[PDB]
C-alpha cells in the first residue's frame, strides 16, 4: 500500500493532535435508546 | 417545681440549657410573637388608623396583632405556662428584649405574681447563676420607650409615603432616621461632585552616608516657602536646581514616643474595626457577633459602654501576668471612659473566658472565628503596657531647598505584640545614625504628580461613625439604618463605599424643603435623647409622642397643599434633543424608584395626545482600583466629565451601543446634558441566567401578568419558559394544554402542563397568584393522552404502577437530562424507577 521504509516516533504537539481530529467531543452522552443513534 | 424560661433564639435556648439543667424548661420564642399589623387583612382617617394600627388622636391605642405562623408557638407557650409555676423572661439586655418580654407577658397573662425578668450580659455559668438568683421585675419604662420609637417610625412611614407617591413617585418610602442618613450620604455626594481637584508635584531624594548607609528623603521647601510645583516644567526645573546644589544635614532631631492600646470595643468601634481589618460590613459583623454571643463566647454586642467588670479585669490581668509577664502588665489597670450618656451599666464587647482561643471555636464558622479573634486581641491589648518607640527626624539643605526624613524604631512592643498593624507605615523604617551636622552623598531623584483628594466616600463603618458622632440612632439601631437605607433604594453600596441614587437626592431635597424640623440633625439627636429620658423615667412617653405628632401634622398639612401654596415641588423635567422612536419629539431625563430613564413629554398630555414610550438607561459603574489606594477615588473624580453650565461633575449612562449620555450632578436643578458616541463603562439585564433552546441566546427572569417567568433577550425570539414550584431555570411550555379536568387543591385554578429544562410539570393557570406546582402522575397523563403533543406521548406509555402496586410519578434526571418514572410510598421514594431504553421501558430498583 504505502510502501513505507521505516517508522518514526516522537512527542505529540497539541497543534498536531488538533490537526488530526475532525471535531471536539464535549458531552458524556454515548447513544440514544429511543432510536439507536449517537 | 418546674420553672419556664422563654428565650428568643433557639441557639440561646441551647446555650442557656447548658447551665440551667433539669429543674428548668427552656422554650425558644422565635422572634417577635406580637406586632403591629402589616397586610391589608372622614373614612380616610379610619382606614389610615386601621393600616397603622396606632391611633394618634385617641391617645395612641395600638391594636397589636399576632402574625401568621406565630399562633402555633403562642399555643405551645401558653400550654407550657399553664404547666409551669414561675415564668422567666430571659430576653436580651436592650429595649428590644424588654418589648419582647412585655409582649410575652401580655399574651400569656397572669401578670403580677408569675413573671420574673432575667438580665444577663453573657451566657455563662456565673452570669446565669447571678441572673437567676435575684431576677428583676419587668421594666415597663423601657417597653414604653421602645413602643414610642416604633409608633414614631410607623407614623412617619405611613403618613409620608402617600405624599411622596402623589408628588414624586409611587413605590417610595420614608423613615425618620433613614431619611437623615440619606441626607448625610447625599450631602457628602454633593461635596464630592463639587470638588475640582488641583494638581501638585513632589520630589524625592536618595542619599548615602559617609558610613555607606542609605537614606531616602522628601523635599518640602523652596526659598523658605512651601515647595509645591504646579506643572511638569516647574518640577523639572526644581529637580535640576536640586541636582546642582550640594546637600548637608543641617538638622538632627530625636525623641521617645509611646503608644497606648485601643479601648475595648463598643458596637460602633467593633463595626469599624471589622470593616477595616477583616472587610466585614455591618450586617455580617452583627450577625456573627450575635452568633458568638448566643454560643456564649462574647458579651452582648449592643453596647456603648467601655466599662469592664472587676472579674474581667482580674481574669485578663492574670492571663497577661502568666503568659506575657510583668513588663506587659502594667502596674495598674488601663481605664477607659465612655460617654457620660452611655449605658455605663453595660460592659464592653469582650470574651466570656479569655483562655478560649479562636481556633478552639469548633462550632463557629471561620468568619466568626476571625471576629472572635479580633475581639479577644482587642480585649487583651487594652490592658497591656503601652508600646515604646524612639523617633528620628532629619532635615537636609541644598541651595534654596530643604528636605526631610522621619523614622521610628520600635523597642518595646507589648500591646502591638498581641495586636499588630496591618501594614508598615511610611514612618515604620530605619533612618541611619547620621550625626548632627553630618554630610551626604547623592543619588538620583524622582518626581511625582498628585491631585488633591476629594472628601472620602462613606464606608458602612464610617457612616456608622458619623451617626455615632452626631447622635442619630443608637447601638441597636445602626445595623437597621445601614440596611434600610440600601433596601429602600435611595442609596447603593459598591466598592464597599456609599453612592447616592438620584432619587435619594430628589427625596432628600423635598424632605428638607417641606419637613425641615424632621430632617435637622439637632432635632433628631434631641428626639433620641428624649427617648433615652423616657427609658430613664425622666419623661412621659405619650407626652413626647404627642408633641412630635403635633409638629409633624402641622408640617404635613402645610406640605400637602399645592406647590403655588407652597407644598412639595413635583419631579421637574429636564429636556434634551433626542428623537422619540414613537413620535420623534425632544426627550427629557426622569427619575423613578426603578432608576433614571429617558421619557417623552407626551407622558404629560391627555390620552388623545399621550405618549408612553420610554428609553431605559444603564449607569456606568465606577471601578475603583484597589491598587491605587487613596488615589482610587481621586482618579474616579478625574474620570468624570464636567458640566458646561456649572462646576459640578457629571454622571454617565449608556443609551445605545453607539451612544452614551452624560448628566449633571445637580439634575434636575441643573439642566446640562451631553451626548457622545464615545462610550465609557457599560452593563446589562440579568435574573436566573438561562440559555434559550430556540436561539441559544441569554434568557432572563421577568414578572407581570405571567408572574415569575423567563424570557429570551433576543428581540427576534419571544420564547418564554415558566418558573415552577421546586425547580430553577424555567421549563417553557411547548405543551401548555390548559388541562381543565385537573383541579388545583390549594386554590380554585386548574392545572396546565408545561415543559422546560427542569422537566415536564403541572402548574396553575395562575402561577403569578396560585404559584402551585406539582409533578404529573403517569395515570394522570394516560387520562389525557390525546392532548399531549407528539413527543411526550411516550410518557403515557410508561408503566403506571410499580410491582408493589404503588402509583408512579414523572421525574427528570438532570445528570442524564432525561425523563423517568419513579414510585413513591408514604411520600418517600420506593426506590423503583423505569427509564426508556431503546423503545422499551427498562424498570428496576434504583
Ligand atoms: Zn414620544
Ligand atoms: Zn450642571
Ligand atoms: Zn431565544
Short mmCIF file of C-alpha atoms in Angstrom, two decimals, chain B residues 160-468:
data_model
loop_
_atom_site.label_atom_id
_atom_site.label_comp_id
_atom_site.label_asym_id
_atom_site.label_seq_id
_atom_site.Cartn_x
_atom_site.Cartn_y
_atom_site.Cartn_z
CA UNK B 160 -45.30 60.46 54.47
CA UNK B 161 -45.31 57.63 51.91
CA UNK B 162 -48.62 58.56 50.18
CA UNK B 163 -47.41 62.16 49.94
CA UNK B 164 -44.23 61.01 48.20
CA UNK B 165 -46.27 58.74 45.94
CA UNK B 166 -48.51 61.64 44.92
CA UNK B 167 -45.85 64.33 44.46
CA UNK B 168 -42.77 62.35 43.36
CA UNK B 169 -43.23 58.66 42.57
CA UNK B 170 -45.20 55.62 43.64
CA UNK B 171 -43.17 52.99 45.44
CA UNK B 172 -41.18 55.41 47.55
CA UNK B 173 -40.81 55.02 51.30
CA UNK B 174 -39.70 57.28 54.13
CA UNK B 175 -38.35 56.96 57.65
CA UNK B 176 -37.28 59.31 60.41
CA UNK B 177 -33.64 58.29 60.94
CA UNK B 178 -33.42 56.67 57.49
CA UNK B 179 -34.08 59.99 55.76
CA UNK B 180 -31.40 61.70 57.86
CA UNK B 181 -28.86 59.03 56.92
CA UNK B 182 -29.76 59.51 53.26
CA UNK B 183 -29.31 63.25 53.81
CA UNK B 184 -25.80 62.61 55.15
CA UNK B 185 -24.85 60.48 52.14
CA UNK B 186 -26.35 62.99 49.69
CA UNK B 187 -24.51 65.89 51.33
CA UNK B 188 -21.22 64.03 51.01
CA UNK B 189 -22.02 63.24 47.37
CA UNK B 190 -22.62 66.93 46.73
CA UNK B 191 -19.35 67.86 48.42
CA UNK B 192 -17.52 65.28 46.30
CA UNK B 193 -19.05 66.28 42.97
CA UNK B 194 -18.49 69.97 43.74
CA UNK B 195 -14.79 69.24 44.26
CA UNK B 196 -12.38 70.27 41.50
CA UNK B 197 -9.01 68.54 42.05
CA UNK B 198 -5.97 70.78 41.96
CA UNK B 199 -2.59 69.43 40.84
CA UNK B 200 0.65 69.41 42.83
CA UNK B 201 4.07 67.81 42.40
CA UNK B 202 6.55 66.39 44.90
CA UNK B 203 10.23 65.43 44.74
CA UNK B 204 12.06 62.53 46.40
CA UNK B 205 15.77 62.31 47.14
CA UNK B 206 18.26 59.47 47.54
CA UNK B 207 21.38 59.79 49.65
CA UNK B 208 24.23 57.77 51.12
CA UNK B 209 26.15 58.43 54.31
CA UNK B 210 29.94 58.59 54.61
CA UNK B 211 29.42 55.33 56.53
CA UNK B 212 27.84 53.86 53.38
CA UNK B 213 24.34 53.60 54.85
CA UNK B 214 21.47 54.80 52.67
CA UNK B 215 18.69 57.32 53.33
CA UNK B 216 15.66 58.48 51.37
CA UNK B 217 14.00 61.85 51.89
CA UNK B 218 11.23 64.09 50.58
CA UNK B 219 11.60 67.72 49.54
CA UNK B 220 9.32 70.34 51.05
CA UNK B 221 10.67 73.90 50.88
CA UNK B 222 11.88 76.31 48.21
CA UNK B 223 13.16 79.82 49.05
CA UNK B 224 11.93 79.26 52.67
CA UNK B 225 8.39 78.82 51.26
CA UNK B 226 6.45 75.57 50.81
CA UNK B 227 7.69 73.54 47.85
CA UNK B 228 4.64 72.74 45.71
CA UNK B 229 5.31 73.00 41.95
CA UNK B 230 2.20 73.34 39.83
CA UNK B 231 3.33 71.88 36.49
CA UNK B 232 5.81 69.45 34.95
CA UNK B 233 8.23 72.10 33.63
CA UNK B 234 8.47 73.70 37.08
CA UNK B 235 9.13 70.31 38.67
CA UNK B 236 11.89 69.53 36.14
CA UNK B 237 13.48 72.92 36.85
CA UNK B 238 13.34 72.22 40.58
CA UNK B 239 14.93 68.79 40.05
CA UNK B 240 17.71 70.44 38.04
CA UNK B 241 18.39 73.06 40.72
CA UNK B 242 18.37 70.31 43.35
CA UNK B 243 20.84 68.10 41.50
CA UNK B 244 23.20 71.04 41.00
CA UNK B 245 23.03 72.05 44.69
CA UNK B 246 25.08 70.43 47.47
CA UNK B 247 23.37 68.72 50.41
CA UNK B 248 24.07 68.83 54.16
CA UNK B 249 22.14 67.52 57.18
CA UNK B 250 21.56 70.82 58.96
CA UNK B 251 19.01 69.33 61.39
CA UNK B 252 19.15 66.28 63.69
CA UNK B 253 16.09 65.62 65.90
CA UNK B 254 15.34 62.70 68.22
CA UNK B 255 12.63 61.90 70.75
CA UNK B 256 10.90 58.97 72.51
CA UNK B 257 7.33 58.04 71.65
CA UNK B 258 4.69 55.93 73.39
CA UNK B 259 1.51 54.35 72.06
CA UNK B 260 -1.43 53.20 74.20
CA UNK B 261 -3.72 50.31 73.25
CA UNK B 262 -7.18 50.99 71.91
CA UNK B 263 -10.24 50.92 74.12
CA UNK B 264 -12.27 47.68 74.24
CA UNK B 265 -14.93 47.56 71.56
CA UNK B 266 -18.23 49.34 71.75
CA UNK B 267 -20.51 48.27 68.89
CA UNK B 268 -19.61 51.15 66.57
CA UNK B 269 -15.90 50.59 67.20
CA UNK B 270 -16.36 46.87 66.57
CA UNK B 271 -18.01 47.56 63.22
CA UNK B 272 -15.26 49.99 62.21
CA UNK B 273 -12.55 47.52 63.20
CA UNK B 274 -14.21 44.61 61.42
CA UNK B 275 -14.60 46.67 58.25
CA UNK B 276 -11.02 47.94 58.28
CA UNK B 277 -9.22 44.71 59.23
CA UNK B 278 -11.48 41.90 58.00
CA UNK B 279 -13.65 43.58 55.36
CA UNK B 280 -16.90 42.57 57.04
CA UNK B 281 -19.51 45.25 56.66
CA UNK B 282 -22.25 45.89 59.20
CA UNK B 283 -24.72 43.09 58.52
CA UNK B 284 -22.08 40.34 58.58
CA UNK B 285 -20.38 41.82 61.64
CA UNK B 286 -23.55 41.98 63.70
CA UNK B 287 -24.79 38.57 62.52
CA UNK B 288 -21.52 36.90 63.50
CA UNK B 289 -21.38 38.85 66.77
CA UNK B 290 -24.92 37.69 67.58
CA UNK B 291 -23.90 34.10 66.86
CA UNK B 292 -20.80 34.43 69.06
CA UNK B 293 -22.91 35.86 71.90
CA UNK B 294 -25.63 33.22 71.58
CA UNK B 295 -23.00 30.47 71.60
CA UNK B 296 -21.72 32.14 74.77
CA UNK B 297 -18.20 33.21 73.82
CA UNK B 298 -18.64 37.01 73.92
CA UNK B 299 -20.60 39.58 75.90
CA UNK B 300 -23.68 41.27 74.47
CA UNK B 301 -22.83 43.02 71.22
CA UNK B 302 -25.17 46.04 71.53
CA UNK B 303 -23.34 48.43 73.84
CA UNK B 304 -21.90 51.92 74.06
CA UNK B 305 -20.11 51.27 77.38
CA UNK B 306 -16.35 50.74 77.54
CA UNK B 307 -16.63 49.62 81.18
CA UNK B 308 -15.28 46.25 82.31
CA UNK B 309 -16.18 44.16 85.35
CA UNK B 310 -13.63 43.52 88.06
CA UNK B 311 -13.96 39.84 87.15
CA UNK B 312 -12.95 40.61 83.56
CA UNK B 313 -10.08 42.87 84.62
CA UNK B 314 -8.72 40.30 87.07
CA UNK B 315 -9.03 37.48 84.52
CA UNK B 316 -7.21 39.37 81.78
CA UNK B 317 -4.54 40.64 84.18
CA UNK B 318 -3.96 37.04 85.27
CA UNK B 319 -3.64 35.96 81.65
CA UNK B 320 -1.13 38.71 80.92
CA UNK B 321 0.88 38.02 84.08
CA UNK B 322 1.09 34.30 83.30
CA UNK B 323 1.73 34.42 79.55
CA UNK B 324 3.46 37.75 78.89
CA UNK B 325 4.86 38.59 82.32
CA UNK B 326 5.37 41.63 84.46
CA UNK B 327 6.78 44.05 81.87
CA UNK B 328 3.45 43.86 79.99
CA UNK B 329 1.06 44.03 82.96
CA UNK B 330 1.37 47.11 83.73
CA UNK B 331 1.32 48.33 87.35
CA UNK B 332 -2.38 49.23 87.35
CA UNK B 333 -5.47 48.80 85.14
CA UNK B 334 -5.95 50.76 81.93
CA UNK B 335 -9.14 52.76 82.48
CA UNK B 336 -11.25 53.96 79.56
CA UNK B 337 -14.08 56.49 79.75
CA UNK B 338 -17.25 56.14 77.69
CA UNK B 339 -19.70 58.96 77.00
CA UNK B 340 -21.49 60.36 80.05
CA UNK B 341 -24.80 59.42 78.40
CA UNK B 342 -23.59 55.88 77.67
CA UNK B 343 -25.18 52.76 79.18
CA UNK B 344 -22.41 52.56 81.78
CA UNK B 345 -24.35 49.72 83.44
CA UNK B 346 -23.38 47.65 80.38
CA UNK B 347 -19.98 46.14 79.65
CA UNK B 348 -17.81 46.35 76.57
CA UNK B 349 -17.74 43.56 73.99
CA UNK B 350 -15.25 41.10 75.47
CA UNK B 351 -14.58 37.36 75.66
CA UNK B 352 -16.52 35.45 78.27
CA UNK B 353 -13.45 33.29 79.00
CA UNK B 354 -10.08 34.70 77.98
CA UNK B 355 -8.42 31.28 77.72
CA UNK B 356 -10.73 30.15 74.90
CA UNK B 357 -8.61 30.71 71.79
CA UNK B 358 -10.28 31.44 68.46
CA UNK B 359 -9.03 28.18 66.94
CA UNK B 360 -10.90 26.27 69.66
CA UNK B 361 -14.31 27.54 68.46
CA UNK B 362 -15.22 24.20 66.90
CA UNK B 363 -18.85 25.19 66.27
CA UNK B 364 -18.24 28.68 64.83
CA UNK B 365 -17.73 29.33 61.12
CA UNK B 366 -14.33 30.67 60.13
CA UNK B 367 -15.53 34.25 59.74
CA UNK B 368 -16.91 34.10 63.28
CA UNK B 369 -13.60 32.70 64.49
CA UNK B 370 -11.89 35.72 62.91
CA UNK B 371 -14.33 38.11 64.58
CA UNK B 372 -13.78 36.41 67.93
CA UNK B 373 -10.03 36.66 67.39
CA UNK B 374 -10.43 40.39 66.82
CA UNK B 375 -12.49 40.78 70.00
CA UNK B 376 -10.01 38.71 72.02
CA UNK B 377 -6.98 40.56 70.68
CA UNK B 378 -8.53 43.94 71.45
CA UNK B 379 -9.58 42.86 74.95
CA UNK B 380 -6.12 41.55 75.81
CA UNK B 381 -4.40 44.57 74.24
CA UNK B 382 -6.48 47.15 76.11
CA UNK B 383 -4.96 46.23 79.49
CA UNK B 384 -1.35 45.81 78.35
CA UNK B 385 1.57 48.21 78.76
CA UNK B 386 1.96 50.88 76.04
CA UNK B 387 4.43 50.23 73.25
CA UNK B 388 7.68 52.22 73.15
CA UNK B 389 9.23 53.77 70.04
CA UNK B 390 12.21 56.06 69.52
CA UNK B 391 11.97 58.55 66.70
CA UNK B 392 14.42 60.40 64.48
CA UNK B 393 13.82 63.38 62.23
CA UNK B 394 16.37 64.72 59.79
CA UNK B 395 16.47 67.85 57.70
CA UNK B 396 18.94 68.44 54.89
CA UNK B 397 19.58 71.62 52.95
CA UNK B 398 20.78 72.37 49.45
CA UNK B 399 20.61 75.79 47.85
CA UNK B 400 17.08 77.20 48.08
CA UNK B 401 15.67 73.82 49.18
CA UNK B 402 15.10 71.79 52.34
CA UNK B 403 14.24 68.10 52.52
CA UNK B 404 13.12 65.91 55.37
CA UNK B 405 13.07 62.34 56.67
CA UNK B 406 11.16 60.90 59.63
CA UNK B 407 11.63 57.40 61.02
CA UNK B 408 10.70 55.41 64.11
CA UNK B 409 12.31 52.32 65.63
CA UNK B 410 10.48 50.00 67.99
CA UNK B 411 11.92 48.86 71.29
CA UNK B 412 9.07 47.61 73.45
CA UNK B 413 6.07 46.14 71.72
CA UNK B 414 3.68 44.94 74.36
CA UNK B 415 0.25 45.86 73.05
CA UNK B 416 1.47 45.78 69.45
CA UNK B 417 2.60 42.20 70.07
CA UNK B 418 -0.94 40.95 70.63
CA UNK B 419 -2.49 43.40 68.13
CA UNK B 420 -0.11 44.00 65.22
CA UNK B 421 -0.55 46.56 62.48
CA UNK B 422 -1.96 45.51 59.12
CA UNK B 423 0.98 47.01 57.20
CA UNK B 424 4.09 49.04 57.91
CA UNK B 425 3.57 52.79 57.74
CA UNK B 426 5.73 55.33 55.96
CA UNK B 427 7.49 56.14 59.26
CA UNK B 428 8.00 52.44 60.10
CA UNK B 429 11.56 52.37 58.80
CA UNK B 430 15.17 52.82 59.94
CA UNK B 431 16.87 56.14 59.35
CA UNK B 432 20.64 55.61 59.70
CA UNK B 433 22.52 57.19 62.60
CA UNK B 434 23.76 60.27 60.77
CA UNK B 435 25.49 62.79 63.02
CA UNK B 436 24.33 66.27 63.86
CA UNK B 437 25.69 68.40 61.04
CA UNK B 438 26.62 65.30 59.03
CA UNK B 439 27.43 65.13 55.31
CA UNK B 440 25.71 63.29 52.48
CA UNK B 441 26.46 61.92 49.02
CA UNK B 442 23.85 61.96 46.34
CA UNK B 443 21.88 59.56 44.15
CA UNK B 444 19.30 60.29 41.54
CA UNK B 445 15.99 61.90 42.30
CA UNK B 446 12.41 61.21 41.37
CA UNK B 447 9.40 63.47 40.75
CA UNK B 448 5.80 62.57 41.50
CA UNK B 449 2.48 64.07 40.47
CA UNK B 450 -0.60 64.18 42.66
CA UNK B 451 -4.13 65.56 42.68
CA UNK B 452 -5.81 66.71 45.87
CA UNK B 453 -8.14 64.17 47.45
CA UNK B 454 -11.86 64.88 47.48
CA UNK B 455 -13.68 64.15 50.74
CA UNK B 456 -13.71 60.39 51.13
CA UNK B 457 -16.88 58.49 50.30
CA UNK B 458 -18.57 56.94 53.31
CA UNK B 459 -17.98 53.33 54.11
CA UNK B 460 -20.61 51.48 56.11
CA UNK B 461 -18.41 51.77 59.18
CA UNK B 462 -17.52 55.41 58.56
CA UNK B 463 -21.21 56.24 58.17
CA UNK B 464 -21.81 54.45 61.48
CA UNK B 465 -19.02 56.59 62.95
CA UNK B 466 -20.67 59.74 61.61
CA UNK B 467 -24.03 58.74 63.09
CA UNK B 468 -22.36 57.97 66.43
#
